[PDB]
Design a protein around this ligand. Sequence first.
Ligand SMILES: Cc1cc2nc3c(=O)[nH]c(=O)nc-3n(C[C@H](O)[C@H](O)[C@H](O)COP(=O)(O)O)c2cc1C
Ligand SMILES: Cc1cc2nc3c(=O)[nH]c(=O)nc-3n(C[C@H](O)[C@H](O)[C@H](O)COP(=O)(O)O)c2cc1C
Ligand SMILES: Cc1cc2nc3c(=O)[nH]c(=O)nc-3n(C[C@H](O)[C@H](O)[C@H](O)COP(=O)(O)O)c2cc1C
Ligand SMILES: Cc1cc2nc3c(=O)[nH]c(=O)nc-3n(C[C@H](O)[C@H](O)[C@H](O)COP(=O)(O)O)c2cc1C
Lengths: 311, 311, 311, 311
Amino acid sequence: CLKLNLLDHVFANPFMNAAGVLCSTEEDLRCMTASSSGALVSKSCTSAPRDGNPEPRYMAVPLGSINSMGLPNLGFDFYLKYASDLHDYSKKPLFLSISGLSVEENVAMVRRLAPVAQEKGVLLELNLSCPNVPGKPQVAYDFEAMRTYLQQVSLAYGLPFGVKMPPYFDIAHFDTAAAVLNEFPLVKFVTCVNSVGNGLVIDAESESVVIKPKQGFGGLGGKYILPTALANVNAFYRRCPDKLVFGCGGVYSGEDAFLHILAGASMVQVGTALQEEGPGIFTRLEDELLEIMARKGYRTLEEFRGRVKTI
Amino acid sequence: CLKLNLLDHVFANPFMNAAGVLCSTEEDLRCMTASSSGALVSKSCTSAPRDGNPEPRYMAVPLGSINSMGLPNLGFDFYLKYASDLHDYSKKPLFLSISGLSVEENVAMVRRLAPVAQEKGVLLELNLSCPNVPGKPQVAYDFEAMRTYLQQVSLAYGLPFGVKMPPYFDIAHFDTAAAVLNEFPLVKFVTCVNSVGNGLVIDAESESVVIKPKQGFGGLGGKYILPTALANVNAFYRRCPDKLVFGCGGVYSGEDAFLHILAGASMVQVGTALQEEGPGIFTRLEDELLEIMARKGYRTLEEFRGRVKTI
Amino acid sequence: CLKLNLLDHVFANPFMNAAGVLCSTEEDLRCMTASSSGALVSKSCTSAPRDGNPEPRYMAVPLGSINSMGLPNLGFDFYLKYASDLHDYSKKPLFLSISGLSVEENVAMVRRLAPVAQEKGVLLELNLSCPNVPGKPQVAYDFEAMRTYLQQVSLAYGLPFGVKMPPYFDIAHFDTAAAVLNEFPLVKFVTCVNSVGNGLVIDAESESVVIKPKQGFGGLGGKYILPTALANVNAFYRRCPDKLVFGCGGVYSGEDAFLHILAGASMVQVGTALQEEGPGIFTRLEDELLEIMARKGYRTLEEFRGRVKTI
Amino acid sequence: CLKLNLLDHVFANPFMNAAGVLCSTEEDLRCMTASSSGALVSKSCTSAPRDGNPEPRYMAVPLGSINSMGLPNLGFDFYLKYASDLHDYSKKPLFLSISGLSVEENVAMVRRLAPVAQEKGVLLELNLSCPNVPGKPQVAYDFEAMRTYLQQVSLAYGLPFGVKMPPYFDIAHFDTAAAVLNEFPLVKFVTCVNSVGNGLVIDAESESVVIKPKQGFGGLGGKYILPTALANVNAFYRRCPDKLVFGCGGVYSGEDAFLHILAGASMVQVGTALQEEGPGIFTRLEDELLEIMARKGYRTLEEFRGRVKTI
Ligand SMILES: Cc1cc2nc3c(=O)[nH]c(=O)nc-3n(C[C@H](O)[C@H](O)[C@H](O)COP(=O)(O)O)c2cc1C
Ligand SMILES: Cc1cc2nc3c(=O)[nH]c(=O)nc-3n(C[C@H](O)[C@H](O)[C@H](O)COP(=O)(O)O)c2cc1C
Ligand SMILES: Cc1cc2nc3c(=O)[nH]c(=O)nc-3n(C[C@H](O)[C@H](O)[C@H](O)COP(=O)(O)O)c2cc1C
Ligand SMILES: Cc1cc2nc3c(=O)[nH]c(=O)nc-3n(C[C@H](O)[C@H](O)[C@H](O)COP(=O)(O)O)c2cc1C
């Protein structure tokens, strides 16, 4: 079975959407809850509604996707209200991603989320890796900034929560990031990873960048970022032994999800692939993941999670 | 024509091999020199010869490659010897990529290199972004270290040279890296970019990592990193106006090379693609680039360099 | 818009799945129907259920895929049942691919399919190009054989239908195949092309073929055959002016579909790319094709279909 | 050793250029002779000089090439004059590729070539698979015409010779083609394969075919056709046991050449790759093939020729 118990919650399966994909509106959330996904995470929100960056801000490309959405969301209020009143937790666990543009904006939000998570069970995913807000660089790329955010969020939230991490490409950054992460016992999970910040897709024909925000610089997702995502899931799975690592990046197949789990992933989030395929992808991913586990003789996810064989 | 005059040199075309690919042995260099490439850069060398990391250390994958070569080179002595005696400069400009594991080591090399560069015109490409030497994190990810390396190298070299840059994925990082690079007038060119550091490719069937070194972590190249290379080439093209930007990454066609140049690249280096196709690729890339320039009405690379239109 | 009216049916977009890919089970079909694809075609079926050829029988390779599936299907009964009862035609047009191993079998099937198509509008795609059934060479390669199959089908079916054509690599064959197809007015569409037959993928390390059937000979699909697919789509688009030409082969991007449509394709089918990416590919393809039409100022597909420019 | 004895000739290695690539002018021939290739083949020639088809007629694409050269050759006289007076047989065996547009043209040539072949040892490669001469279909796709061509050629030549075969994609075709081939004992070798006929490359940007001849239809070469080439090499390796099969198609590395030999190739020709890389590729291919044989413990090609393992 693909079931698993994480953060005092039961998950039909490890699949769920990657924050920002089909989880902005009540309808996306209701669809995600309706899908066969093991859980769902709401759009990374801020205090007030955000129109996001100017369009075109998302482009589906052959190897995945580039995007500079710019945290377009219906506002914390809505998502908190969804978590507190609209979500049917009998259906599946809900993760509410937050992404205040300042540590105090995040603190202000988690204080309000606290009583709801306390009462509802909604799980907080602190997004410290948005690479698409102009003027706002991935917070988790600034280690002390991240350290502060977590001290401030831990303090004001006082409940278990996770952090959506930006991909790191330096072994030292793997070490340091995990060092920071491990100083916070409330950080029960880290989601690896967020879009590979600030890629640039150029259309040769038009000789123009494909997205409008930040001169075409946006987060890369999809096939492009799989090896990078697996590295981070694994790097942090090893470094953060007392925490759960949620895999995210380049998942299109049960095989991809399998490598993620093999890499140490508990939950496996699907961004780009979901963006293009729709919630139906989860049933497919689950079947695919099961066909594989079948072949390999794995009855449970635990049997092979983080069991990637090295040479 | 695809001819460009850069760094007091004439290049037949903007194409060349990426440091490390087909440029380790004397035969690779002779092979690169014989190729139709506008130039060639040698394998990143250390003072002493290096066996590199344990094999398998390079894996070609559908979307490029992952490698943890570990700077396997024949030693500075050889490459400086090739630079000073073996390379036929009448054929094409030669770049000597130096990748000391310490600032002292690089200073020891660039010191012995200077006289040669002075007479032969060999161009120095300082590698401040190798992501595969165990315990040696990408120097260019450490802005202060990068600065120390640049002033020590600039000082001991006293000649124009370039830097092989690591891909950055944070706007603040492009700005700070440029801030560091721009302090040194001798740094005439920055090559963007080196392998996307510490990806992890897992074979679902064997449930094992494809490469042996560092538990499967290696630099990614090819398709995967194209948007990341264009972003970086463009990021530093804009930020380092007084410097040339050599594009490297994801180049398989003249279209890719077109995007790189459109982004700001002067020279375009081919890594993975060359690794899997042989030097014949340069002829193709050149025909292809010319076919694109022909259609768009471009007679010179200068006409469309850095001319990537934004929305 | 990508909409288009073909064979008295409305198609949301030109995109669909290549027969045999994600369309063998009821779940595959419901998955394709749920996708953003403008239509779907069921697995080439035979009178009774087939287990197909010995596995491994499919191999995704860097440049596409090879496969000797061997017409593994749930039997004609199932797919007619799907056509007649399961498929929601409000969603999108359904094509039912038939691939009897003899003319009598196809006739027996189409006779039963007729009443269904007659009432539901399910479209027949006669597969005269399967290159994986041991002992059964592609029908469309024996022109007299093809002429007979079409006489019998046209006669026994009496309704408009299409033919999945094998790739031809001889101008004489384009002429003759077309000459043959054009004798059958019921042949409203010809899908170019089926897999490039009997290619052989050999693994260097194992020094063994990658698939088990027919000593490793299987149909190639994907990147490998795009040029070949455009040729056929174009050759037949030119030769069968009274018929529609459905493109298929090497479609991974909206640009590939664009070439197909530019070559003369009405519907564009995705096989290998879909096999590996999942139904999400259609949304991506649609977005990519639209962005291209956008840049080129095309409001409709009919604006650039078969408008490939020659020199 | 890469050395092999064939057709009563000694070959340093199995490599040679593909007919048409680097072998049209006296200088090309001199380059191929100078190269480290074990043998060379002259451009397919016709009795009289041919300008070939209108340019552009050859396009190097990311997966190989497309071409409609139209047999541009310096005429049989020159080539016969090369084989009789200019070639240095002390360097490497010479194959003279003949491609008459009529059976009488081929007979006219082989008659005159016979004496020179009797004296100099030049080997005849009858091209029965050109797919780029307007109005002239691949002769070998016409089993009877092919039969007639070989009766006439075998009669007028009376000496050992080979045939440049077009790739087949139908098992029955392999069987029949072999059936026709096997009748002639003088046909000591069949070169598999020639270009994959009449692929269509269209440039999405210009929306135009890349080559001018035949509305863009040209032979496909390079990476595209490797699997097809290995298939044909192996198909004819098994079907024509008393004949040598020279492999040709998709060779870029010693690994590819290794696959061809594995498949059953005695000699391995390089076309597209050579077209882009130059005669230097042969040294590279020989090094690479030896490096593979080194690891597999193969001391000779004979040890692994046609030893491809099937599942
Ligand atoms: C349209 C778009 C919007 C996204 N919005 C968010 C966001 O709100 N918060 C967040 O943590 N991640 C967001 N993501 C990033 C994904 O959650 C994920 O980190 C990234 O897409 C890589 O996963 P993938 O390859 O599965 O696409 C977004 C991604 C895309 C495609
Ligand atoms: C075989 C292997 C060796 C490499 N060696 C070096 C090197 O010595 N110095 C360097 O700066 N980059 C080295 N690289 C990185 C490449 O130079 C190039 O930056 C990277 O592959 C991205 O380019 P690509 O996408 O074209 O492959 C190496 C890459 C690989 C595949
Ligand atoms: C797994 C596999 C199964 C297929 N089954 C069928 C089939 O049943 N009937 C048919 O006409 N084509 C079948 N095809 C051929 C494809 O429909 C398609 O024509 C071919 O794959 C070329 O397109 P592609 O490059 O998009 O893969 C199959 C292909 C593959 C990949
Ligand atoms: C420029 C060009 C010219 C060619 N000329 C001939 C030739 O005249 N005779 C011939 O039999 N094949 C000719 N071919 C086909 C090649 O010999 C070879 O069979 C085909 O290109 C596939 O091999 P490859 O993948 O290594 O390119 C030519 C191909 C190209 C690229």
